[PDB]
Amino acid sequence: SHMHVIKRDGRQERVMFDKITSRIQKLCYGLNMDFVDPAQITMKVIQGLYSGVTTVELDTLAAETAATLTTKHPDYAILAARIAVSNLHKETKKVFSDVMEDLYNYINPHNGKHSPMVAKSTLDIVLANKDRLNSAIIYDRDFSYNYFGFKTLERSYLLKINGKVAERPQHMLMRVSVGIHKEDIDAAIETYNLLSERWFTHASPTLFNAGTNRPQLSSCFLLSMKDDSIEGIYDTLKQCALISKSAGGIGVAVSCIRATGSYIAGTNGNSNGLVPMLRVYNNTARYVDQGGNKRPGAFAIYLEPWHLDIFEFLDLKKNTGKEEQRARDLFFALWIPDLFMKRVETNQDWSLMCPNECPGLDEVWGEEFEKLYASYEKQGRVRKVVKAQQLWYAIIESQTETGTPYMLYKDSCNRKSNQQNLGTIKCSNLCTEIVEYTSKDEVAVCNLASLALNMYVTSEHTYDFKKLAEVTKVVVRNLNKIIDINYYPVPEACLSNKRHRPIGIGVQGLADAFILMRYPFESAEAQLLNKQIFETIYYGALEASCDLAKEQGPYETYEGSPVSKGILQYDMWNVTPTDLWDWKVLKEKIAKYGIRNSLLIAPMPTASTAQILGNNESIEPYTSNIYTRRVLSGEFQIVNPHLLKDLTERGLWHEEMKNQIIACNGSIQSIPEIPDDLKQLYKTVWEISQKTVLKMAAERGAFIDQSQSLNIHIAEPNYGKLTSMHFYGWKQGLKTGMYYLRTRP
Amino acid sequence: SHMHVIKRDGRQERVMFDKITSRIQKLCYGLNMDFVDPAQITMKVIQGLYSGVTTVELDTLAAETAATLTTKHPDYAILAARIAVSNLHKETKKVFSDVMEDLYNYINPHNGKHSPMVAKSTLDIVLANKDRLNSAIIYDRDFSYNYFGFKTLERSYLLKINGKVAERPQHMLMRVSVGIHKEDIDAAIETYNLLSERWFTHASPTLFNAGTNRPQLSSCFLLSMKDDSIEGIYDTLKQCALISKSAGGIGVAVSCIRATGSYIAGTNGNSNGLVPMLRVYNNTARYVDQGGNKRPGAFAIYLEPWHLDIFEFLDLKKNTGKEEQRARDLFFALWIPDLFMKRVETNQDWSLMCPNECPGLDEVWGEEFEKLYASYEKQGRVRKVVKAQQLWYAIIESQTETGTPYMLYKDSCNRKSNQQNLGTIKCSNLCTEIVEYTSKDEVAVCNLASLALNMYVTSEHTYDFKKLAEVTKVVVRNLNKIIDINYYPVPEACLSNKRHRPIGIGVQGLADAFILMRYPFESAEAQLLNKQIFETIYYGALEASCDLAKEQGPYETYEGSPVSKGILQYDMWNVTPTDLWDWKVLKEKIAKYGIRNSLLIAPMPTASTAQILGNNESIEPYTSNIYTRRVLSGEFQIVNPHLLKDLTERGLWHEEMKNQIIACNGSIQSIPEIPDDLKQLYKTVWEISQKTVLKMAAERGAFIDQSQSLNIHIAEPNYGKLTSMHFYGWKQGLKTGMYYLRTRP
Ligand SMILES: Nc1ncnc2c1ncn2[C@H]1C[C@H](O)[C@@H](COP(=O)(O)OP(=O)(O)OP(=O)(O)O)O1
Ligand SMILES: Nc1ncnc2c1ncn2[C@H]1C[C@H](O)[C@@H](COP(=O)(O)OP(=O)(O)OP(=O)(O)O)O1
Ligand SMILES: Nc1ncnc2c1ncn2[C@H]1C[C@H](O)[C@@H](COP(=O)(O)OP(=O)(O)OP(=O)(O)O)O1
Ligand SMILES: Nc1ncnc2c1ncn2[C@H]1C[C@H](O)[C@@H](COP(=O)(O)OP(=O)(O)OP(=O)(O)O)O1
Ligand SMILES: Nc1ccn([C@@H]2O[C@H](COP(=O)(O)OP(=O)(O)O)[C@@H](O)[C@H]2O)c(=O)n1
Ligand SMILES: Nc1ccn([C@@H]2O[C@H](COP(=O)(O)OP(=O)(O)O)[C@@H](O)[C@H]2O)c(=O)n1
Ligand SMILES: [Mg+2]
Ligand SMILES: [Mg+2]
Ligand SMILES: [Mg+2]
Ligand SMILES: [Mg+2]
């Protein structure tokens, strides 16, 4: 008949338009009514309406229209967040316990199987404790997310039932706290309130599988080859298949595979090298997706540069060429020793050999690698001799073209790690921050936890240090409770992760801490500031693991580590820390009790986590002050809201200032309406000299017991800033030369 | 600030959308609610709304959107009429008297002059009689117009004040009845109620200037040249300028101007002919517009075919050629005698002469013209001799290309008219229906009144005859009261229009009378029907003028007319009328009292009048069953609503039948969903053989004392149907061969 809409109860009515403005103005309380205008939003919604429309599409399109209108006044972000979050909170259930009973009592709607979303012990903990725990949840905190962080949180992370999302966000975060803190409830309420107050957040597989039926909370996996045979290659392929099933990240050390042309004693033939093998890993990276297709399964391939197939390895992730000689859905990385640095330095030659001819090489680092490599370089057992600057030119061609390979430094990582007593660290994970020991028997597993920073900044614009160590103590107790609950997908993972027991802590949003502390990025108080911050994080981490080892005893391989010898991570950098803390009593209690976890700190990139909480990616500056937004039918420009927060107060903001920053791509310094302080507080990273950031990485990574991601931003391809940049990173002592060479077009 | 609309009081408010659907559903009472849908109309209105919009634009766009949605169901025409008419009736004043005081008390808003819209005697009649007359008006009748008839009535006919229309339609029709019936009120209330019940309507200059300050109620003007000198040409140009100022229609007899090359005794030169002279009349037709630019001033130019400049006259209204040899904003017509018919008939020759050489020719018709033309054809005084079929081929080239010239028959008009005693009828008006005597002293003026037809059809589908003569009596009393109130623009007009005193009555919408009487157009009861109708109209007209002559005496030149000799118009056609009436007592009372008006009946085209009342153009069939509508941003297709009225009852109407009639251009007979009666009741005029219509014109024009318009519709250029058509019209005896040759593309 007429234009009827399908009202959410399931019924239909006539189109009465004042229900829209009746609802929006109800959801506009507490905003600037001088620019909050329900009529424009209603008008663009009615531009899209038709007959027979479910009303949840009208609320979705209402929040979408408010998100597109956010450019006119910044309160429409708060409005659009209230529209989407109110749309969800009207939909699903109020009580957490009946949601959990609905998830456990799930039935596959065409197979009849009692196929739960949560394990029965999780439901046991909930139903035994629902009275305190339903009282602990606070739904006032769900209106605190950004809109785009809420849509990113909704599209993939909330547990769905037949396509309809059936979890509020506090149901997910309380589900995580039950999923980790099993027996105890006080830790679940301190962990819940410290969690939902957005102080720290766990990693994404923890948000996937906390308390579910297959609890695989880990996110870091480091695998090396079992053998240089078909059985080793395909058994390693099997382990990468299972681990990439249970939503992990896999970095593979592929150093020990014989090269093209070496003799095969079994079938009297010659090998074809690494290129079809890594092509098999290419199709495996396409087939298995992490979890329920939530993100594609990605593999890192690490190769040391002395291997003979290095040129076809570097020409492998490209765009042109034959298709059968490209494997472009992987991530390639070079695990470079100091000798290739020295031979590129003085234009000498370089010996590409085959690890069947020269066996047992990648397990040897430093001066011993110099002696063994020189002794094989003497005997003439090598196969090819290439001038080192030619291969360096090939590396800069590959990084210039695609950004791959990554570059890590072998002797720097093997020298400055707490797992020296085990052997030689072969590889690292996909995002190049977990530097741990791998073997044929031990497959390295590490857990993650990302602390935010800008929630700690007080109103005095003086940073809070004493809170940060305290939350770090709660985090270390969380991860150390994670390691003993996790279900490892392969049997080699449990022995490594329970013998050595590592954790991982990484912060996100350093640029917001600098803006809210009101310092320039290349100032003196910034370089003092991050140094003091990671002294606080590192100190509180060591105090927390000390207080755990006082209660459960240290890990199984402690005596032999340099921490048992008193050398902490900063002395391996030979940098005495500041007088901000008391390190003597810390080293006394460590010398009397040990520590519980081997490796502690690890700055991860946190793309998706910082996408949720609105912070910037972990430590880098803003890419531009204008950042785009992916909206259906609108992909548009939103300025940095801290910059806009200062501009509305300083008066220089007007109705075309956005258009004034369109034609400069974030560069606010070219405009004549300038207080000449925003040019220091809001430096575009393209307008930031990279070597100051590298010095800041030398200080901060000098207070980190693992590596850290390092997105290199360079506007134009030039070999001097690249070559001097990598050599400068090697001279400062960094464990990671690069993670991406990013060139803006 | 926000989106505020300017509410009609002059204020502003927020955009609240349920005021729209709150109003439309209030204006939807009495319609089919199964398809009446306010939400679609509201949706397309809100597609056009913006901030700072006057609400009368929202009602205008609402009625416009309903007019475009009328295709889905025919009740949206009734809706859109109620929207526009309610928009006007909310706007202007309720009382007629204060509107008249506002119009008389008008002041030019930048000259201060008391420049009235009505004369002071009109306001005297209103203010002396406002108590009965404000009670007589019925505003229930304004919701009876069509939408497009109301917009056509509003854009040009209602008297505006500074661009804002300040007259309701009943204010205009009551203003007309006061403007004609001055002293009497009973005639103003019978005339008002018979008028506003849409029975008959006056002509368009009557609607322009009834009771205004310059009352020029006439619409027919026939002028001939005073002299074949510069003084005669430019004095005639002066009279055409003044008459075209006061909104008349001018037909000019340009027979008596000497041709190209004749000697000029004053300045010893030779004339250039007619072409630059008619070019001067071209620019005069562009400059002076009728009234307040309400329609462009148009001139008819009549020429008899024996004049020497006839070839450049026929090649004059074209599209190509040099610009200085074209006069295309005129209307050209040939005033053909029988001799050109006979010489084209038998392929003989034809004598093109010059009226300076052969003087006193156009004042002579018939056999006397044959004798005088043969005597000048004998003496060799002629100048050119052209084969007659060549000039006939030139005429068919001109009518084929543009439709001009018109064709009238000289001896047929001079033989069958009541003004034989005066002399020779030279010319006729622009629309070729007023055939009256012109002279140097008498400039012919005729008034018009168009009766509708389909209001007379009773529910029994038997036509009402006794009402039609009665309304015809009221009409004849109206026009005879018009002639004595009118203000003639030139002094020669008053002597003609008061000596001979003619009137004019023409009907509109014959196709609707045939459909509502349910007969085929080419049936037997149609040809019986229009014959009976014009016997009724002609009989009631003669009875009315008889009853006027019983009270005031006949006109000044009665004794000498053939009506005084007893011969009425039908005996000049030698057709005895039917036994429907009593003609003997009529001819007795005429023989004892005479008649008051010389010429009575005149079928005019009525483009604009039938555009108001929704009827078809006067006597022709429908051009197509689908007719387009001019709407801003929508120029679309609406079917004939009587056809649609039968299709919704007979069930064959469905939701794509319009699309089934798109690809046939009104031809409903090609579709397979056919009751084979609609193919007879709804014949497209392109699917109608023209000679049956010509026979119907012989009967109906055999009962008309003047000529009648005749739009000839022929789909393709073919010389046989044209030539046989004009010869057939001459053989039936018609006074008008053609008014347009229309070819659909
Ligand atoms: N009758 C209607 N016609 C068109 N849109 C409507 C109508 N009613 C509500 N809407 C719009 C307004 C909102 O933008 C959106 C959601 O309305 P909403 O009221 O929340 O559904 P609902 O009526 O079931 O919720 P609730 O019953 O709790 O009020 O749909
Ligand atoms: N048929 C083959 N095609 C391509 N590559 C092969 C083939 N067989 C073996 N390889 C590669 C896989 C390993 O990289 C390598 C050795 O495999 P492996 O089983 O150890 O050889 P083998 O034991 O039979 O001879 P060897 O004793 O020399 O190793 O050669
Ligand atoms: N506040 C509004 N915002 C947008 N459109 C409106 C608003 N109010 C009325 N309209 C629409 C409804 C109608 O289609 C059109 C004209 O409204 P209308 O009510 O007749 O003006 P009005 O309010 O001055 O008349 P009245 O005072 O007699 O009610 O404008
Ligand atoms: N100068 C001119 N240019 C063009 N046409 C002219 C001119 N003078 C006269 N005519 C035309 C207009 C008339 O159609 C025609 C006669 O005009 P008119 O005044 O009667 O001439 P006339 O009286 O001086 O000489 P005649 O006695 O021959 O008419 O000649
Ligand atoms: N595309 C990616 C990126 C990272 N990761 C893994 O997630 C870890 C940290 O990356 P991250 O914190 O940016 O991942 P998110 O938590 O943001 O999803 C890495 O060590 C990888 O193991 C992944 O599996 N797939
Ligand atoms: N374009 C026109 C059409 C007609 N007319 C005059 O109006 C008379 C009848 O034409 P009509 O009845 O179609 O004119 P309307 O009343 O429809 O405007 C003609 O005799 C002309 O004198 C005109 O002046 N201009
Ligand atoms: Mg509701
Ligand atoms: Mg082997
Ligand atoms: Mg109103
Ligand atoms: Mg003269």
Mutation for A interface: B17, B33, B37, most A CBs within 10 A: B17
Q: Which residue has the tokens 């003597």?
A: A584
Which residues of chain A make contact with B22, given a CB cutoff of 8 A?
none
> Distance between CA atoms of B245 and B103, rounded to whole angstroms?
22
User: Minimal CA–CA distance to B4: which of A24, A48, A40?
Assistant: A40
Backbone angles phi, psi at B636, to 5 degrees: -130, -170
Through-space distance between the first and last CA atoms of chain A, rounded to whole angstroms: 54
Measured CA angle at B281 (ends B278, B283), to 5 deg = 120
Please state, in angstroms and as integers, the Cα–Cα distance from residue A555 to each residue in A483, A498, A559, B641, following that order: 13, 8, 9, 94
**What secondary structure, in 3-state letters, does B587-602 show?**
HHHHHHHCCCCCCCEC
Ramachandran sector of residue B247 (left: φ over 0; alpha: ψ -120 to 50; beta: rest): left
Residue B502, φ and ψ in degrees, nearest 5: -95, 160
Task: Find, among B512, B446, B545, B421, the residue nearest to B205 by Cα.
Answer: B446
* Residue among B199, B147, B204 at smallest CA distance from B172: B204
Annotated catalytic residue within A64, A304, A433, A442? A433
Q: Which helix (H) or strand (E) holds A300?
A: strand A299-303
- Strands, sheet with A331-336, edge to edge from the N-terminal-most edge strand: A444-446, A220-224, A250-253, A299-303, A331-336, A406-409, A736-738
For residue A342, give the nearest of A732, A731, A29 by alpha carbon.
A731
Residue written as token pair 């391939």: A301
Measured between alpha carbons, how far is A353 from A305 in angstroms, rounded to an integer? 10
Indicate the DSSP class of residue B131.
H
d(CA A246, CA A443): 15
The answer for residues whose C-beta is within 8 angstroms of residue B425's C-beta and 6 or more apart is: B413, B414, B417, B419, B435, B436, B437, B438
From CA A673, how far away is CA A349, in angstroms rounded? Answer: 56
DSSP letter for each residue of A96-146:
HHHHHHHHHT---TTT-----SS-HHHHHHHHHSHHHHHHH--GGGGGGS-
What residue type is assigned to position B486 of the chain? N
- Report resolution (Å) to 1 decimal: 3.3
Q: Write out the residues surrounding ion ligand 10, Cβ under 5 A.
A: B 229
* Alpha-carbon radius of gyration of chain A: 27
Phi, psi of A155 (to 5 degrees): -70, -20
Least Cα distance to A451 among A599, A619, A577 occurs for A619
- Percent helix, percent strand, percent coil in chain B, to nearest 5: 45, 10, 45
Using DSSP, state whether B707 is helix, strand or coil: coil
Cβ proximity of B236 and B226 under 8 Å: yes
Judge whether B556 and B596 are in contact, CB under 8 Å. Answer: no
A433 counts as catalytic: yes
Catalytic residue among A354, A431, A446, A546: A431
Q: Could you tell me the two tokens for B503?
A: 């009137």
Instruction: Tell me which residues of B are annotated as active site.
Output: 429, 431, 433
Tell me how far CA of residue A680 lies from CA of A149, A669, A683, in angstroms. Answer: 28, 9, 6
Cα–Cα distance for residue pair A483/A597, rounded to 1 Å: 10
Query: Is the CB of A46 less than 8 angstroms away from the CB of B49?
Result: no
Query: Two tokens at B331?
Result: 């209307």
| Residue B113 in tokens | 């002059």
Mutate to test the pocket of ligand 2, among A229, A234, A236 (most ligand atoms within 8 A of CB): A229
- For ligand 4, whether the C-beta of B578 sits within 6 Å is no
Method: cryo-EM
Q: How many CB atoms lie within 10 A of CB A375?
A: 11
CA distance A662 to A660: 6
Q: Is the CB of B167 under 6 A from ligand 3?
A: no
Q: Torsion-angle region of residue B295: left (phi > 0), alpha (psi -120 to 50) or beta? A: beta
Which residue of B5, B25, B46, B73 to mutate against A (max A Cβ within 10 Å)? B46
A42 to B17: CB separation less than 8 angstroms, yes or no = yes
Tell me how far apart the alpha carbons of residues A59 and A45 are, in angstroms, rounded to a whole number. 9
Q: How many residues does chain A have?
A: 745
For chain B, how far is it from start to end, CA to CA, in angstroms? Answer: 54
Q: What does the alpha-carbon distance between residue B352 and residue A133 come to, in Å, rounded to a whole number?
A: 116
Task: Report yes or no: A434 and A503 within 8 Å, Cβ to Cβ.
Answer: no
| HSE (side-chain half, CA atoms, 13 Å) at A329 | 15
From chain B, the residues in CB contact with A18 under 8 A are: 16-18
Ligand 2 mean position, distance from CA A268 (Å): 9
Instruction: Write out the residues surrounding ion ligand 8, Cβ under 5 A.
Output: A 229
Q: What angle do CA B354, B360, B362 make, to 5 degrees?
A: 80
Cβ proximity of A741 and A399 under 8 Å: yes
Distances (CA, A) of B614 to B511, B626, B635, B637: 12, 14, 18, 16
HSE at residue A533, side-chain half, CA atoms within 13 A, is: 28
Among B422, B558, B594, B455, which Cα is nearest to B141's? Answer: B455
CA neighbor of A242 nearest in space, from A295, A278, A288, A293: A288
DSSP string, A515-570: HHTT--TTSHHHHHHHHHHHHHHHHHHHHHHHHHHHHH---TT-BTBTTTTT--HH
CB A55 within 8 A of CB A6: yes
User: Shortest CB distance from A3 goes to which of B1, B34, B39?
Assistant: B39
User: d(Cα B480, Cα B489) in Å, to the nearest integer?
Assistant: 19
**What residues of chain A have any CB closer than 8 angstroms to a CB in chain B?**
1-3, 14-18, 21, 34, 37, 39-40, 42-43, 46-47, 49
Which of A14, A18, A34 is nearest residue B39 as measured by Cβ atoms? A14
Chain B residues lying within 8 Å of A3, measured CB to CB: 37, 39-40, 43
Q: What is the DSSP letter of B28?
A: G
- Read off the tokens for B343: 């010489």
Q: Which residues of A define the annotated binding site for ATP? A: 7-8, 13-19, 55, 59
Can you point out the beta strands (E) in B392-551?
406-409, 444-446, 449-452, 506-508
Non-local CB neighbours of B358 within 8 Å, separated by 6+ positions: B376, B381, B382
Cβ contact B603:B709 at 8 Å: yes
> Nearest CA to B697 among B607, B622, B620, B609?
B620
Neighbouring CB atoms inside 10 A of A725's CB total: 18
Reduce the DSSP state of residue A218 to 3 states and report it.
Answer: coil
> Exposed (0-12), middle (13-18) or buried (19+): which is A1, by Cβ within 10 Å?
exposed
- Residue closest to B274 by CA, chosen among B249, B302, B250: B302
Cα atoms found within 13 Å of the Cα of residue A626, Cβ hemisphere only: 16
For B336, left (φ over 0), alpha (ψ -120 to 50), or beta? Answer: beta
Instruction: Give the residue among A374, A381, A375 at the shortest CA–CA distance from A338.
Output: A374
Give Cα separations from B399 to B275, B298, B389, B419 (angstroms): 19, 19, 15, 31
Could you say which DSSP state residue B27 is in? Answer: G
Annotated binding site of A: 7-8, 13-19, 55, 59, 204, 219, 228-230, 245, 258, 265-266, 429, 433, 606-609
Contact state of B16 with A18 under an 8 Å Cβ cutoff: yes
Q: Sort out which chain A residues have CB atoms less than 8 A from B34's CB and list them.
A: 1
Helix (H, G, I), strand (E, B) or coil at A656: coil
Pocket test for ligand 1, best of A2, A5, A6, A7 (most atoms within 8 A of CB): A7
Bridge-based pairing of strands A711-713 and A740-742 is parallel
Q: Kindly give the pairing relationship between strand B200-202 and strand B449-452.
A: antiparallel
- For residue B448, the CA-to-ligand 6 centroid distance in Å is 10
Record the tokens describing residue B136, joined without a space.
């007589």
Task: Determine the Cα–Cα distance for residues A365 and A357; give it in Å rounded to an integer.
Answer: 19
Q: Ligand 3 within 6 A of B52 CB?
A: no
How far is Cα of residue B579 from the mean position of the Cα atoms in its chain? 31
Ligand 2 binding pocket, CB closer than 6 Å: A 228-230, 257-258, 264-267, 271-272
Q: Quote the CA–CA distance of B674 and B190 in Å, as a whole number.
A: 45
Angle value at C-alpha B213, between B209 and B216, nearest 5 degrees: 40
From CA A410, how far away is CA A569, in angstroms rounded?
17
Instruction: Tabulate helix, strand, coil % of chain A (nearest 5).
Output: 45, 10, 45
Alpha carbon dihedral A383, A388, A392, A397, in 10-degree steps, equals: -60
